[PDB]
Amino acid sequence: GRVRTKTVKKAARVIIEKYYTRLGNDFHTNKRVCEEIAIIPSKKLRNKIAGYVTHLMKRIQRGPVRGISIKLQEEERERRDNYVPEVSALDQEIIEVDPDTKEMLKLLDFGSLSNLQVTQPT
Amino acid sequence: PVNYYVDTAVRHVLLRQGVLGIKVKIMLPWDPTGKIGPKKPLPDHVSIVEPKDEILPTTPISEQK
Amino acid sequence: EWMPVTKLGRLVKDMKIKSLEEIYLFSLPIKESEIIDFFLGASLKDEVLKIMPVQKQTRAGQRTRFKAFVAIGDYNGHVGLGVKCSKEVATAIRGAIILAKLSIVPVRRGYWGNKIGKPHTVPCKVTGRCGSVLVRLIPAPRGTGIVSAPVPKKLLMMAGIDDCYTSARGCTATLGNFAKATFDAISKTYSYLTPDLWKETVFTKSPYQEFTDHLVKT
Amino acid sequence: VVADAGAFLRHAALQDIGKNIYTIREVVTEIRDKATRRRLAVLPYELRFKEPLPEYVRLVTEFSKKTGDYPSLSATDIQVLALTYQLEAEFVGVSHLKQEPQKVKVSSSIQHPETPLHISGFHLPGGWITPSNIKQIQQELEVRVGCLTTDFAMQNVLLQMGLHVLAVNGMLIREARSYILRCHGCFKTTSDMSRVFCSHCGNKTLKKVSVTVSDDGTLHMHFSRNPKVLNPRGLRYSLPTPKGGKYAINPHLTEDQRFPQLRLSQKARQKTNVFAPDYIAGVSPFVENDISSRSATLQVRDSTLGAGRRRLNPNASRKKFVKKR
Amino acid sequence: SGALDVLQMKEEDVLKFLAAGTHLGGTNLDFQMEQYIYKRKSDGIYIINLKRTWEKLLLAARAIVAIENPADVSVISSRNTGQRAVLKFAAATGATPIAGRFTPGTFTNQIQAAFREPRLLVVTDPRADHQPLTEASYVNLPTIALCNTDSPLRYVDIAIPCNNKGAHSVGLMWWMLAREVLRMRGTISREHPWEVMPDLYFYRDPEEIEKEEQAA
Amino acid sequence: MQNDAGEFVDLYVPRKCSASNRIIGAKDHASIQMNVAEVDKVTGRFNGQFKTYAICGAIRRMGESDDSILRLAKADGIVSKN
RNA sequence: ACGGACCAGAGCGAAAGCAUUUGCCAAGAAUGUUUUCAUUAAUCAAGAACGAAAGUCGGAGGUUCGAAGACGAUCAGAUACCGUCGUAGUUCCGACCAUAAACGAUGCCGACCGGCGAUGCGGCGGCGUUAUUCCCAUGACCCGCCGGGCAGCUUCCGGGAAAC
RNA sequence: GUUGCUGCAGUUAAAAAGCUCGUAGUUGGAUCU
């Protein structure tokens, strides 16, 4: 039918790896930016490498890829990653703890901890 | 690329008992011709020029020139 | 022209590592053929121990390919042993040589009677056990020569051992096992602890840990 | 009348019941069943998509993490909860609904968690499934707005609030009887019945506990005071050295360990259904076993297949000639 | 800890640990790890001695600090719990991170794309990331690893006993190690509590992202 | 190793495992030379000085190398009593 | 005549072997022992007991089954396969006989070298639950620890032509 | 090191008796300046 070939796929992956700055969603902007960078021969391999590149960034808008790895993730992934909440999830009011744990704590010099609730195994 | 990379040469040495043809097909390299090689590469090979690394911007800088 | 890939390689390229001994001291793996070819240079000769032709079972039928056993040796120090299989014989040989340079080991050389002059023999009676072949090296007095079967004779000669009583057990006829046994015996000479190495080993910085600043630039 | 994904999934045709039929656009697009989507393609269109204010979403989540259900929930689940809350706030009085729920009452019994109470067929000392009982099998059944949530985690938060909700049935739901899993290490409960490791400390230590939620807003848990449950029997057993590759099946110890993909072929995982209209024509009464493919010769097995074999303690004695896959 | 008051585990730290669940180890137990344990409770869960943890952590930090180029230290998490955390650690310390699939022959095969030579290896889970342990064993890397109660201790040099099955547990540990390496370096002061929140290291999880996109 | 006259006639003197006193071989690639740093006993900061441990491959294969490391640290006051 | 199902990688027996109840007869291991004796032992040519099945003499007995054998079917050539019947035998008693892939295809006694928890027997220490809440001990469960068992899983201890 | 005292073997390669007792033989725990 119409399946993409090893050279074309490899070229597309390389372009994505080195130039995610310059691409887009729109197909024809991917196509004039490939003649400028890479020393490709002419159209029918210049047009099958710019066409698997538009395909491969919509799938980035489905999340991650299993083929590329460039420390960037646009300007949204980073934002989502270096996120932090208002108060830390470890700053808790009352922490539920076992008797054994309490005993251990006691035999560690930490008998004077205040935040603990020793819940019994009922 | 079989027409401008490989170069076939068929001759006949004449030894005593029969004949021995020879077929020496030499695929030529790239590097456009400083006497050597065809200009245009293989239409399969794609080379990707390393990006000239631009400035990551710090401050909106106006420098009048 | 050589362009190194490994960290060790880069160090070697320059003058940061002085001898092959600094690699062996920290037991680092030599992954590039050139490092050995650089340090020992022209002193490394080689002996093709065997070319056995084998026919490989393929779905295309049977085709001929050759197995080469090569024992590389700089005399008075270092041996190595390589085994390669290839279409051509020359290819097989060169591959084996390359492979045998990656496997270069130092041998400890001892004395038989009183320790007068240079060492000549195996330091203590060692053994090399490799798949039903059992090779034993025994210290011989000076000038006895290597009293062995031809293959470990070669291997011991290229190790720089002058004299050694050998004794083999088991199916010594299968060459690979025999040569590999003897190599295994000769490697084990450094691995054997005598009273000579009882002093607590003071630790020098590793080639990596010493030239860290020079490896930043590369 | 806010509809959850379960309403369409169970084909609750209660489009006749309410007039305030509102839903999220996301929950209706998330359904992967064809018959429900076919139902969506035809049904008397009086439904209307709506997305609520961030003020209300913030308010639902505020105490959803206090009731201990927010981890069990989904994002779209919160969307439906928020939709109902802002819809009740729009028409009816907001003052009805309470913020920060009730202190849960612990009431232990000596029953094993696996006792088949609340299972419709099973009966002790008459409880029968009949051609009259079949439509009646729902839950514990007892004016303007409500929900159509079949998820308990949903129902729990809804009834803690005091938001009057219901099921596939016509009438309002009063008491909500279900099971939840409690980790006996860190005591962090999840309403998610499917999971086997806790969300908090990640061990395989989740144990089944029955809960009830009244329409008033009260929660109570029945803990098991039965030694068989907290018993350290088949727990310590020596494990194999970690093997990697394409075939190596590791013993499954965290929720997020990367397994090598070993799927069954489509010849293998095809079950025979007798009720198909064109079943009678096909030569043999059963669909053929797979024996030809690699999955068979590698003995790739279904997740459900070999279930009780896992529940036996590994320091026991299997029959002298069996090896347990 | 060299019997110092300066490095000794404090009250806040213990509370953080407990909150995380680092003390609550696994149910199974390898006998090699049994040294680092407190006691098995009648439930079945082995409780990790927390003082034992701390010293090991300190040791790990002291190993990491003993490396001159911080980008020698290769840090690996193969399973998703540690992905973010490891990256954060890398960002902080200056270490080189391997996230996700560790390609076999990253450490051995010198004719690779991502061939690299570390002076040290730090791994999240000696079970899950067994492959880089084996690779380390070929190429002379001492190994730090977060070992659970159940974990094979093959090729692990400095082992840090802690729960690593949990999501908060993995990340908190990483945070703490980072903190210790930086304090040890002198790039943070020990007295003033660190600006960076230990919550930043935790695993994000795709659907909890959308639950936190809504409530903002 | 050392001849009658007094020369050190040996290519190299191999390091021994600190844990078992076994000789680390030439091609012992599971062998480790770990540096573990020392601190200021007032500041709690890296001095520039470290104590080094060698482990042979054979110990490291058996999983005792952890314990050995621990015990060496103990011996040196790098891991405290208890 | 035979003792099913319960019947297990459960037990016991030197091995062959050994399973309905009850009673009698004499043994036996393991365990517990601040009991006694004080080297009395380990292995063992000659020699001596026991030794599945089959078979052999003598008596008794023949239910089933059943070598032999007889019929019946079945075909270029069928004389083994299959069916019906059926002798010795298979059953017991007293003598013989002494071999089996009598198998762990792995001498016996002893020392050392990783780990794990199930089980069987005995013992020790334990909060509890159960004998309609038992009134005290005792039984049945549960958590451990000890010794000898029959086994198992795991381990780059080391071995090994190798599977192991 | 294919007769093996030094120095062989006996799972599957040739090989450990069916099992136990047992006369000779060989071999036998420390412990006394």
UniProtKB/Swiss-Prot annotation, chain A:
Task: Give the CC-aspect GO terms.
Answer: cytoplasm; cytosol; cytosolic ribosome; cytosolic small ribosomal subunit; focal adhesion; membrane; nucleolus; nucleoplasm
Which Pfam families does its entry note? Ribosomal_S17e
Modification Phosphoserine, positions:
S112
| Residues joined by cross-link Glycyl lysine isopeptide (Lys-Gly) (interchain with G-Cter in SUMO1) | K102
A Gene Ontology molecular function term for this protein is: RNA binding
Location in the cell reads: Cytoplasm; Nucleus, Nucleolus
- Maturation and modification: Ubiquitinated at Lys-102 by RNF14 and RNF25 in response to ribosome collisions (ribosome stalling).
Q: What is its main location?
A: cytoplasm
Positions where N6-succinyllysine occurs in the chain: K18
Q: Which GO terms describe its biological process?
A: cytoplasmic translation; erythrocyte homeostasis; ribosomal small subunit biogenesis; rRNA processing; translation; translational initiation
Residue(s) of cross-link: Glycyl lysine isopeptide (Lys-Gly) (interchain with G-Cter in SUMO2): K102
Q: Which InterPro entries match?
A: Ribosomal_eS17 (IPR001210), Ribosomal_eS17_CS (IPR018273), Ribosomal_eS17_sf (IPR036401)
PROSITE patterns, per database record: RIBOSOMAL_S17E
Q: Which UniProt keywords apply?
A: Cytoplasm, Diamond-Blackfan anemia, Isopeptide bond, Nucleus, Phosphoprotein, Ribonucleoprotein, Ribosomal protein, Ubl conjugation
Q: Which disease is noted in the annotation?
A: Diamond-Blackfan anemia 4: A form of Diamond-Blackfan anemia, a congenital non-regenerative hypoplastic anemia that usually presents early in infancy. Diamond-Blackfan anemia is characterized by a moderate to severe macrocytic anemia, erythroblastopenia, and an increased risk of developing leukemia. 30 to 40% of Diamond-Blackfan anemia patients present with short stature and congenital anomalies, the most frequent being craniofacial (Pierre-Robin syndrome and cleft palate), thumb and urogenital anomalies.
UniProt xrefs under HAMAP family: Ribosomal_eS17 (MF_00511)
Name of the protein in its database record: Small ribosomal subunit protein eS17
Q: Which gene encodes it?
A: RPS17
From Swiss-Prot, chain B:
TM spans (from-to)? none
Impact of mutating S47A?
A: Reduced phosphorylation by IKKB
What range of the parent protein does this fragment cover? 163 to 227 of 243
Report the protein name in the record: Small ribosomal subunit protein uS3
Q: How does it assemble?
A: Component of the 40S small ribosomal subunit. Identified in a IGF2BP1-dependent mRNP granule complex containing untranslated mRNAs. Interacts with HNRPD. Interacts with PRMT1; the interaction methylates RPS3. Interacts with SUMO1; the interaction sumoylates RPS3. Interacts with UBC9. Interacts with CDK1; the interaction phosphorylates RPS3. Interacts with PRKCD; the interaction phosphorylates RPS3. Interacts with PKB/AKT; the interaction phosphorylates RPS3.
Q: Which residues form the Glycyl lysine isopeptide (Lys-Gly) (interchain with G-Cter in SUMO2) crosslink?
A: K52
Quote the annotated effect of T33A: No effect on phosphorylation by PRKCD
Q: Mutating T59A has which effect?
A: No effect on phosphorylation by MAPK. Significantly reduces phosphorylation by CDK1 and nuclear accumulation. Greatly reduced phosphorylation by PRKCD. Abolishes phosphorylation by PRKCD
| Family named by the database record | Belongs to the universal ribosomal protein uS3 family.
Subcellular location field: Cytoplasm; Nucleus; Nucleus, Nucleolus; Mitochondrion inner membrane
Q: How is it modified after translation?
A: Methylation by PRMT1 is required for import into the nucleolus and for ribosome assembly. Sumoylation by SUMO1 enhances protein stability through increased resistance to proteolysis.
Q: Where are residues bearing Phosphoserine located in the sequence?
A: S47, S62
Give the sites modified to Phosphothreonine.
T58, T59
Using the UniProt entry, state the residues involved in the cross-link Glycyl lysine isopeptide (Lys-Gly) (interchain with G-Cter in ubiquitin), renumbered to this chain: K40, K52
Curated annotation (Swiss-Prot), chain C:
Cross-link Glycyl lysine isopeptide (Lys-Gly) (interchain with G-Cter in SUMO1) per UniProt, renumbered positions: K217
Localized where? Cytoplasm; Nucleus, Nucleolus
Query: Disulfide bonds, which pairs?
Result: none
One GO CC term of this entry?
Answer: cytosol
Cross-link (Glycyl lysine isopeptide (Lys-Gly) (interchain with G-Cter in SUMO2)) at which positions? K217
GO: which molecular function terms?
A: cadherin binding; enzyme binding; fibroblast growth factor binding; mRNA binding; RNA binding; structural constituent of ribosome
Keywords annotated in UniProt: Acetylation, Citrullination, Cytoplasm, Isopeptide bond, Nucleus, Phosphoprotein, Repeat, Ribonucleoprotein, Ribosomal protein, Ubl conjugation
Glycyl lysine isopeptide (Lys-Gly) (interchain with G-Cter in ubiquitin) crosslink residues: K217
Give residues where Phosphothreonine occurs: T194, T212
Modified how: Citrullinated by PADI4 in the Arg/Gly-rich region.
Task: Name any Gene Ontology BP term.
Answer: cytoplasmic translation
Q: Which domain of life is it from?
A: Eukaryota
S5 DRBM domain segment(s): 44-107
List every position bearing Phosphoserine: S206
Q: Can you tell me which family this protein belongs to? A: Belongs to the universal ribosomal protein uS5 family.
As for what it does, the entry says: Component of the ribosome, a large ribonucleoprotein complex responsible for the synthesis of proteins in the cell. The small ribosomal subunit (SSU) binds messenger RNAs (mRNAs) and translates the encoded message by selecting cognate aminoacyl-transfer RNA (tRNA) molecules. The large subunit (LSU) contains the ribosomal catalytic site termed the peptidyl transferase center (PTC), which catalyzes the formation of peptide bonds, thereby polymerizing the amino acids delivered by tRNAs into a polypeptide chain.
Q: What is this protein called?
A: Small ribosomal subunit protein uS5
Upper lineage? Eukaryota, Metazoa, Chordata, Craniata, Vertebrata
Query: From which residue to which, out of the full length, is covered?
Result: 59 to 276 of 293
Curated annotation (Swiss-Prot), chain E:
Task: Give each disulfide bond as a residue pair.
Answer: none
Q: Where is this region: Laminin-binding?
A: 160-179
Describe its function.
Required for the assembly and/or stability of the 40S ribosomal subunit. Required for the processing of the 20S rRNA-precursor to mature 18S rRNA in a late step of the maturation of 40S ribosomal subunits. Also functions as a cell surface receptor for laminin. Plays a role in cell adhesion to the basement membrane and in the consequent activation of signaling transduction pathways. May play a role in cell fate determination and tissue morphogenesis. Acts as a PPP1R16B-dependent substrate of PPP1CA. (Microbial infection) Acts as a receptor for the Adeno-associated viruses 2,3,8 and 9.
Q: What's the reported outcome of changing T53N?
A: In ICAS; reduced protein levels
Q: What is its main location?
A: membrane
What are the subcellular locations of this protein? Cell membrane; Cytoplasm; Nucleus
CC terms in the record's Gene Ontology section: cytoplasm; cytosol; cytosolic ribosome; cytosolic small ribosomal subunit; extracellular exosome; membrane; nucleoplasm; nucleus
* GO molecular function annotations of the record: DNA binding; laminin binding; laminin receptor activity; ribosome binding; RNA binding; structural constituent of ribosome; virus receptor activity
Entire protein: shown range:
2 to 217 of 295
Residues with PTM Phosphoserine = S42
Keyword terms of this UniProt record: Acetylation, Cell membrane, Cytoplasm, Disease variant, Host cell receptor for virus entry, Host-virus interaction, Isopeptide bond, Membrane, Nucleus, Phosphoprotein, Receptor, Repeat, Ribonucleoprotein, Ribosomal protein, Ubl conjugation
Report where the covalent cross-link Glycyl lysine isopeptide (Lys-Gly) (interchain with G-Cter in SUMO2) sits.
Answer: K88
For this entry, the protein name equals: Small ribosomal subunit protein uS2
Q: List every stretch annotated Interaction with PPP1R16B.
A: 53-112
